[PDB]
Design a protein around this ligand. Structure first.
Ligand SMILES: Cc1nc2c3c(ccn2c1C)[C@@H](O)[C@H](O)[C@H](c1ccccc1)N3
Ligand SMILES: *[C@@H]1O[C@H](CO)[C@@H](O)[C@H](O)[C@H]1NC(C)=O
Ligand SMILES: *[C@@H]1O[C@H](CO)[C@@H](O)[C@H](O)[C@H]1NC(C)=O
Ligand SMILES: *[C@@H]1O[C@H](CO)[C@@H](O)[C@H](O)[C@H]1NC(C)=O
Ligand SMILES: [Mg+2]
Ligand SMILES: [Rb+]
Ligand SMILES: [Rb+]
Ligand SMILES: [Rb+]
Lengths: 987, 261
């Protein structure tokens, strides 16, 4: 049955509904049938991910639809070229399938790389069957959590995971950990009384994934599996569909540019094609031929390898990424929305401050012990450390000397486990010390006396007397002390101290901390001789007049590497927002501590405290920080949120629901931000899905938070997020470095064809060799650029403005087509026109000579000298015109990769050899070129012949010209960064 | 997008200026290239180690020279002949008045460039040297007869020499039709099917403006009528090699020949 109505029913009313006992549980027979009706008590996982359908998607996207469209055009053209019967149409086949190959092989690389991803990630999961203690037919016994059915009688204790959604029936001191569902860092009290009508805010319901820290309850199962508050939170979150990554968008702008030219470039040349006089069909074929020459076949691989490389650069740091697009998203991020509990903080109560020897000592609250510990040199501290050690019954589970102390798991209460690791970290071997002082009496915390107390025989036998040690709520210890340890003396509790205590208890109260008082007394060896039979019921020992030791106070403390990570993100121009379901007091505490709320900034609720003016009269522009709680954010709207957001820069969200997280992300995203949500638990899955990149913790994270996330931190080292900005920014630079390089190869690939149709010279460049350039010789250089160091202090830069700053813009492409592309095609034509004229064909004769040139029926064709060539002979000459035009490309593209090393800085100040992969790629570039020419048979295997060594050098004057042209535009843009030169010659 | 109307002029002027600077170096490169190049001799002639050899009349189909005609139907062979007549229209005595009677048979090295307008001396070759098979006495070159005549012609390479030993001769022979067919009977004009050596070496259109290639005919008596047969015509010289699989015309010709009746 429904959510609203389970905590508001009487035991008669619930036990009728589920035909159960509030005291004796279900019958065995019925509980088994209910399981057949409802299935396991677990969450149905995200169902339907066929291995062959994981592969299909890797074939779609900006470049792929372009390439496929291109492959389509190839085949329609090849066919039209079979209607008007053409020979050597093998090119259009060779062409279209090389396109359909790149697209496909990248899909495999992507698929295997996401395969690797999920196995590494499902290698870090928890797969132990959680358990329940159920009562059925009146037998308390243990089952798997998953075999629970609605309407069952269940029991929880300390250490038990709440196995279902439970409605409390009876409860004894039962506090629970809700930080997965809510943000709440402090144990929540759980009672059988209906606290509230919202089943999330009531106290008589226990949630299906939570942790019973202390106490006991029995209660009824009222929801199971997907039907629980956790079931609902993630079925919501799956419903949330996520937008497209910024990198994915950039790539598609780049396609709207490429095609945008290919069409406008193709159409004018077709309209020119008609006027030279051409069958409409052929003119519309050359239109085709050239829109496919505008598309770069290889760049969809270099992009992908580039991303995989930075994927590996992360996972080497335990930062695992589910798809490659996520390798960029942090670089372009501008707002981080961050959870508090479990992500910013450790979600583990540690001891943090201590009032003793009249002073507030702050402890070390870091998991790696890197903070500043307190002063442990006083007789008072030794005494206090004794009482806090001896008056503690918690215990480390066995075999954990390996695992760090914070990481060690303890049997015992919330407040007691914090004190245990505290003793164990400072005193060392806490449980051992505790044993040396045998316990002769003990009282656990009850409301009858409101403290915990234990009496002890001391350590040496020359001291036959006893130590009483007591702890509890600070006032309830103060009313029972007459004496305070101070500085090696035991002074009387005069009013100065009853005020020093009170101001300390309150100073540590406002920080959002649980504070405990400790105390002691040394019972005389005469009144209490060895063997004295203490008794609790009748107090035969003192419970007042005790000697006060001090206060100890604990909080849910930041993760050690967190505050620095927030400081490194903010310096990098990213905005941070807190989003926690926790109460505003502690919400604002941690936000101050880690760097969300700068040291010295106020809410309007803080101005009114010192300005002493009502919060209404306090001015809104003057408040930098703002805590908005969940209730207050309800009565607002997308307009009162944005004005709050762009007014207060250090924003904090307390008491926020899973959905309100989604809302915040949305307002930001709708204001044009690339948001990053950084979460743990289920209250973050929705936010983590709507986010541009959702980042979950690998260890503290829940499955919904992990499943919605794009990126996982397997050490839970929040600093990975800082190196994830700089990697994600670098390769965004190393992409326009790498694309600018591969784009300039299209215009010296296209002009020979544009000329070969426009003036009918013998074909200077064959698209078997274009394939070789785009897919064999220029790949390694383009991927070299992935290894360019930053050219600035990238991590002190604002995030890129998505509207103004695009991966590819009109000046960058135009620069490559019209100025670098223009100079390469000129170094082909010369080296071609000489290879012609050197072998016998003068340029003015090469004009219109094509029709006779390509003719199979003219075996005798005479050159400018008049020698008569046969067809396969000038075929070899045309193939040479290929191989000459080809090494005119490579000689520029050694000057091209060196220039696209650096967008602004001189390669002199940067260096020619900084990038070592880039050198090896240029030695790789110039080796393939040699092998293709001088290997035997290459003239027939491919269109590549042994080339005259004079013809290698013909282009080099042009390669240097390129070097010097971008150098002077790179030297004149840094030395003279005015207005004219900054825009027209830059990319 | 046309954002800044007047600043186009600057970037237009820039591209315009940019391209013109760039077209200049190309011009100034052929300009220097044109003067690197010899007007007399090919710098490399790399692709011509052996020369090509063509045939008349040239009639192709799918997959190479297939000549098929019918003695009785004067339609099937009139255009094969007009091909041979109008081809020799340039070997006529009148239109070859620009060259000279050549007597010295073994070679011809024109070291000195002696002829009008810095010309050199081209040898005469007129139709007469293919005696049975010029335009007269038979306008159909043995086609109406059924013993047709094909003329063979070597492609010219400046300063190429085919050997010292003898005269390079055309050798046309049946190919894989001997089972019941006697070997091919061919009478070549001039006799033995020889190329006279004093047309070597070629010097080029600038040196020899009115040069003309030597010819040998092949009058094929033997050929069986109404049978598909192939015929190969190879040239024989030490500095000549006739079998390259990438180039089938490097020193020979093949042709399918069906003479119908
Ligand atoms: C840039 C470029 N394009 C070609 C090209 C060929 C040869 C060299 N090519 C070069 C250097 C031919 O095989 C074809 O016409 C081919 C083609 C392809 C798609 C659609 C229509 C025609 N296009
Ligand atoms: C070739 O022979 C003579 C030289 O003996 C030459 O003058 C003449 O032009 C040629 N013969 C004829 C018939 O024209
Ligand atoms: C060529 O013609 C002459 C006379 O016209 C003749 O003697 C000779 O046999 C002919 N050749 C052939 C192959 O018939
Ligand atoms: C050759 O042409 C004649 C006249 O047209 C014709 O009757 C004869 O049958 C043809 N021969 C063959 C084999 O077709
Ligand atoms: Mg959390
Ligand atoms: Rb291309
Ligand atoms: Rb400290
Ligand atoms: Rb996401």
């Amino acid at each position: 049955g429904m959510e609203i109505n389970d905590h508001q029913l009487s035991v008669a009313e619930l036990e009728q509904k589920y035909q159960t006992s509030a005291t004796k549980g279900l019958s065995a027979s019925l509980a088994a049938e209910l399981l057949l009706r409802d299935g396991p008590n677990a969450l149905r996982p995200p169902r339907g991910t066929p291995e062959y359908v994981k592969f299909a998607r890797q074939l779609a996207g900006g470049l792929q639809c372009l390439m496929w469209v291109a492959a389509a055009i190839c085949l329609i053209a090849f066919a039209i070229q079979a209607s008007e019967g053409d020979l050597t149409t093998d090119d259009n086949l060779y062409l279209a399938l090389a396109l359909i190959a790149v697209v496909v092989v990248t899909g495999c690389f992507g698929y295997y790389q996401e395969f690797k991803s999920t196995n590494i990630i499902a290698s870090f999961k928890n797969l132990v069957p959680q358990q329940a203690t159920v009562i059925r037919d009146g037998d308390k016994f243990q089952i798997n959590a998953d075999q629970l059915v609605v309407g069952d009688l269940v029991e929880m204790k300390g250490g038990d995971r709440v196995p279902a959604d439970i409605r409390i029936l009876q409860a004894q001191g039962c506090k629970v950990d809700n930080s997965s569902l809510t943000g709440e860092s402090e144990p929540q009290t759980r009672s059988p009384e209906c606290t509230h009508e919202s089943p999330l805010e009531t106290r008589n319901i226990a949630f299906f994934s939570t942790m019973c820290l202390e106490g006991t309850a029995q209660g009824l199962v009222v929801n199971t599996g997907d039907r629980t508050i956790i079931g609902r939170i993630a079925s919501l979150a799956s419903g949330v569909e996520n937008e497209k990554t910024p990198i994915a968008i950039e790539i598609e702008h780049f396609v709207d540019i490429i095609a945008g030219l290919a069409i406008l470039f193709g159409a004018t040349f077709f309209i020119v094609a008609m006027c030279i006089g051409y069958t409409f069909l052929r003119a519309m074929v050359f239109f085709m031929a050239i829109v496919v020459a505008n598309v770069p076949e290889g760049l969809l691989a270099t992009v992908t390898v580039c991303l995989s490389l930075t994927a590996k650069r992360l996972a080497s740091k335990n930062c695992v990424v589910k798809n490659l697009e996520a390798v960029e998203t942090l670089g372009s991020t501008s707002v981080i929305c961050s959870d508090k509990t479990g992500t910013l903080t450790q979600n583990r109560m540690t001891v943090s401050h201590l009032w003793f020897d009249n002073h507030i000592h702050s402890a070390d609250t870091t998991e790696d012990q890197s903070g500043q510990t307190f002063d442990q040199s006083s007789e008072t501290w030794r005494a206090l450390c004794r009482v806090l050690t001896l008056c503690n019954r918690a215990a480390f589970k066995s075999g954990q000397d390996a695992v760090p102390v914070p990481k060690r798991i303890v049997i015992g209460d919330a407040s007691e486990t914090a004190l245990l690791k505290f003793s164990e970290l400072t005193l060392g071997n806490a449980m051992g010390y505790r044993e040396r002082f045998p316990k002769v009496c003990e009282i656990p915390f009850n409301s009858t006396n409101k403290f915990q107390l234990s009496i002890h025989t001391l350590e040496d036998p020359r001291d036959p007397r006893h130590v009483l040690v007591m702890k509890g709520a600070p006032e309830r210890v103060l009313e029972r002390c007459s004496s305070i340890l101070i500085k090696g003396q035991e002074l009387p509790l005069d009013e100065q101290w009853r005020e020093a205590f009170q101001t300390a208890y309150l100073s540590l109260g406002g920080l959002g901390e649980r504070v405990l008082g400790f105390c002691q007394l040394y019972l005389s060896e005469k009144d209490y001789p060895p063997g004295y039979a203490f008794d609790v019921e009748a107090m035969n020992f003192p419970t007042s007049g005790l000697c006060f030791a001090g206060l100890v106070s604990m909080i849910d403390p930041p993760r050690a590497t967190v505050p620095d990570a927030v400081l490194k993100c903010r310096t990098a121009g990213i905005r941070v927002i807190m989003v926690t379901g926790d109460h505003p007091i502690t919400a604002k505490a941690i936000a101050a501590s880690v760097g969300i709320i700068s040291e010295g900034s106020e809410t309007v609720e803080d101005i009114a405290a010192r300005l002493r003016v009502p919060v209404d009269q306090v001015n809104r522009k003057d408040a930098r920080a703002c805590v908005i709680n969940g209730m207050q954010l309800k009565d607002m709207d997308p307009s009162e949120l944005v004005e709050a957001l762009r007014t207060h820069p250090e924003m904090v969200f307390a008491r926020t629901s899973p959905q309100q997280k989604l809302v915040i992300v949305e307002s930001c995203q709708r204001l044009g931000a690339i948001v990053a949500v950084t979460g743990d638990g289920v209250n973050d899955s929705p936010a983590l899905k709507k986010a541009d990149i959702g980042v979950a913790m690998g260890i503290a994270g829940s499955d919904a938070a992990k499943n919605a996330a794009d990126m996982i931190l397997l050490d839970d080292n929040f600093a990975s997020i800082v190196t994830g900005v700089e990697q994600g920014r670098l390769i965004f630079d190393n992409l326009k470095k790498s694309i600018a390089y591969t784009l300039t190869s299209n215009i010296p690939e296209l002009t020979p064809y544009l000329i070969y149709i426009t003036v009918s010279v013998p074909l200077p460049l064959g698209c078997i060799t274009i394939l070789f350039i785009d897919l064999c010789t220029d790949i390694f250089p383009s991927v070299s650029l992935a290894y360019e160091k930053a050219e600035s202090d990238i991590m002190h830069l604002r995030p890129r403005n998505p509207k103004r700053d695009r991966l590819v813009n009109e000046p960058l492409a135009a620069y490559s087509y019209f100025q670098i592309g223009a100079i390469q095609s000129f170094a082909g034509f010369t080296d071609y026109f000489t290879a012609m004229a050197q072998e016998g064909w003068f340029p003015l004769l090469c004009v219109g000579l094509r029709p006779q040139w390509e003719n199979h029926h003219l075996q005798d064709l005479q050159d400018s000298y008049g020698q008569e060539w046969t067809f396969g002979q000038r075929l070899y000459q045309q193939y040479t015109c290929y191989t000459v035009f080809f090494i005119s490309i490579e000689m520029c593209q050694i000057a091209d990769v060196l220039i696209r090393k650096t967008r602004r800085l001189s390669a002199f100040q940067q260096g020619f050899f900084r990038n070592r992969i880039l050198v090896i790629a240029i030695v790789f570039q110039v080796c393939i070129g040699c092998f293709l020419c001088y290997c035997p048979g290459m003239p027939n295997i491919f269109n590549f012949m042994p080339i005259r060594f004079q013809w290698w050098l013909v282009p080099m004057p042009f390669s240097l010209l390129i070097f010097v042209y971008d150098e002077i535009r790179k030297l004149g843009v840094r030395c003279c960064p005015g207005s004219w030169w900054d825009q027209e010659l830059y990319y | 997008l046309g954002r800044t109307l007047s600043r186009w002029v600057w970037i237009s002027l820039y591209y315009v200026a940019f391209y013109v600077v760039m077209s200049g170096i190309f011009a100034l490169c052929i300009y220097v290239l044109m003067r690197t190049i010899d007007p007399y001799t090919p710098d490399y002639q790399d692709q011509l180690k052996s020369p090509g050899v063509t045939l008349r009349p040239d009639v192709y189909g799918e997959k190479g020279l297939d000549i098929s005609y019918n003695v009785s139907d004067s339609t099937t062979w009139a255009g094969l002949a007009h091909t041979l007549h109008r081809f020799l229209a340039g070997y006529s005595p009148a239109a070859q008045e620009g060259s000279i009677n050549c007597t010295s048979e073994k070679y011809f090295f024109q070291e000195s460039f002696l002829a009008p307008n810095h010309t050199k001396f081209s040898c005469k070759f007129t139709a007469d040297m293919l005696q049975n098979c010029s335009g007269r006495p038979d306008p159909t070159f043995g086609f109406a007869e059924g013993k047709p005549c094909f003329i063979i012609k070597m492609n010219r390479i400046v300063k190429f020499l085919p050997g010292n030993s003898t005269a390079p001769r055309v050798d046309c022979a049946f190919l894989d039709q001997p089972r019941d067919g006697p070997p091919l009977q061919v009478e070549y004009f001039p006799a033995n099917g020889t190329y006279s050596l004093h047309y070597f070496p070629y010097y080029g259109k600038k040196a020899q403006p009115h040069y003309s290639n030597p010819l040998v005919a092949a009058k094929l008596l033997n050929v069986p009528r109404n049978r598909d047969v192939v015929i190969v015509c190879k040239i024989l010289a030490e500095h000549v090699s006739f079998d390259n699989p990438h180039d089938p015309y490097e020193g020979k010709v093949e042709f399918k020949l069906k003479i119908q009746k």
